[PDB]
Amino acid sequence: AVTQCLFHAIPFHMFYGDPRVAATMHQDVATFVMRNPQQRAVEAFNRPE
Amino acid sequence: DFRLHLGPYVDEGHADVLEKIFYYVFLPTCTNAHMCGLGVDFQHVAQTL
Amino acid sequence: AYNGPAFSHHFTRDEDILDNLENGTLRDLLEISDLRPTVGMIRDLSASF
Amino acid sequence: ARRLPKPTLQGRLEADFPDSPLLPKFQELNQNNLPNDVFREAQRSYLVFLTSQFCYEEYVQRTFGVPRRQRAID
Amino acid sequence: ARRLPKPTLQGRLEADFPDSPLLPKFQELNQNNLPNDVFREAQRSYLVFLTSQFCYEEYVQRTFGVPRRQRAID
């Protein structure tokens, strides 16, 4: 809440795009994995192509 | 009364799963289900405070 | 750099920054972390910009 | 149908500590429609609400902008 | 297409510290080419640029030659 004006998350790599950490510092994937909880695994997480 | 004095719904990346996973795994194993729910009278505790 | 002591340059170096910084976002940034960087090491930190 | 029992709270605050604020904020209650034994509870519920309001407003006064910009002069 | 939200940055420094040596190097701007709030945030950016300038110039002559013989001779 105090760093939404400082940092924005980029899920770019297979090791470094993870939805457990991305849903913390981004309130868009925090809704996306709220609607698709099976995406919370690091292997099946959707990332921008 | 038939009204629910309830706080507003907030969102997370889990959709209530951590609440229920705590209250239905961690407490009944660790406490051996030695708990009972209670009720409070808020005016009484405020008049004490 | 839009804080109190690092802008004035007549606030001395080896004083705590957490008791004279205003209620900016640096205050809630340094409150949830709880370190005490005295002003002047924040000055060149800003001067890296 | 009923409720939970009553805390003790022994001792009276109004006949002990007379230099408290919100003292004209207490004479505006009704007395003729209910006896004294329930007006006791009706003022016990109300003075705690008044001091809850007062500590909340002093809380939001303190935690508004917590330092002051103008204290940087002195 | 857009940037992050702005930080808090409560109050103003120019309305607090008139004794700043970077204040004469502040007023080379122009209000009348843009609205008030965008000019205000441009003033914030120019002020933090000049603050970084003042901290860097007081840094560069500091760590260059503070161990001196002439202070230690006397």
Question: Is the distance from CB of D6 to CB of B44 less than 8 angstroms?
Answer: yes
Chain D residues with CB under 8 Å of C4 CB are 69, 72
Q: Which amino acid is at D2?
A: R
Q: Is B22 helix (H, G, I), strand (E, B) or coil?
A: helix
Structure tokens at A15: 């090791």
Give the DSSP letter of residue D70: G
Set of chain E residues whose Cβ sits within 8 Å of the Cβ of D73: 16
Resolution (A): 4.3
E23 touches chain C (CB under 8 A): no
C-chain residue closest to A6, CA distance: C25
Distance (Å, whole) CA D6 – CA D9: 9
For residue D15 the two structure tokens come to: 């006949």
DSSP secondary structure of A2-39: -STTT------STTT--HHHHTTS-TTHHHHHHH-GGG
Q: How far apart are CA E63 and CA E58, in angstroms?
A: 9
**Residues of chain B positioned with their CB less than 8 A from the CB of A24:** 13
Residues D15, B9: contact at Cβ < 8 Å? no
In Å, how far from its chain's centre is CA A11? 6
Chain C residues with CB under 8 Å of D65 CB are 22-23
DSSP annotation of D50 reads H
Report the greatest alpha carbon distance in chain B. 38
Residue with tokens 């860097």: E56
Residue pair D66/C23 in contact (Cβ under 8 Å)? The answer is: yes
Q: How far is CA A13 from the centre of its chain?
A: 12
Nearest to D47 by CA among D69, D30, D66, D22: D22
**H-only helix segments in chain C:** 5-8, 25-31, 43-47
If one counts every other C-beta atom within 10 angstroms of the C-beta of residue E16, the result is: 18
C32-C47-E50-C38 Cα dihedral, nearest 10 degrees: 50
Residue of B nearest to A30 (CA): B13
Q: How far apart are CA B22 and CA E2, in angstroms?
A: 40
Q: Concatenated DSSP letters for E4-34? A: PPP----S-STTT-TT-TTSTTT----GGGS
d(CA D13, CA D28): 19
Chains with 3+ CB–CB pairs under 8 A to A are B, C, E
Q: Which experimental technique did the depositors report for determining this structure?
A: cryo-EM
Which ranges of B1-49 does DSSP label H, i.e. alpha helix? 17-21, 27-30, 42-48
Please give, one letter per residue, the 3-state secondary structure of chain D. CCCCCCCCCCCCCCCCCCCCCCCCCCCCCCCCCCCHHHHHHHHHHHHHHHHHHHHHHHHHHHCCCCCCCHHHCC
Copy the structure tokens of residue A46.
Answer: 């959707």
CB contact under 8 A, D52 and B46: yes
Closest residue in E to A6 (Cα) is: E4
The answer to whether chain D touches chain C by having 3 or more C-beta pairs less than 8 angstroms apart is: yes
d(CA E35, CA B14): 43
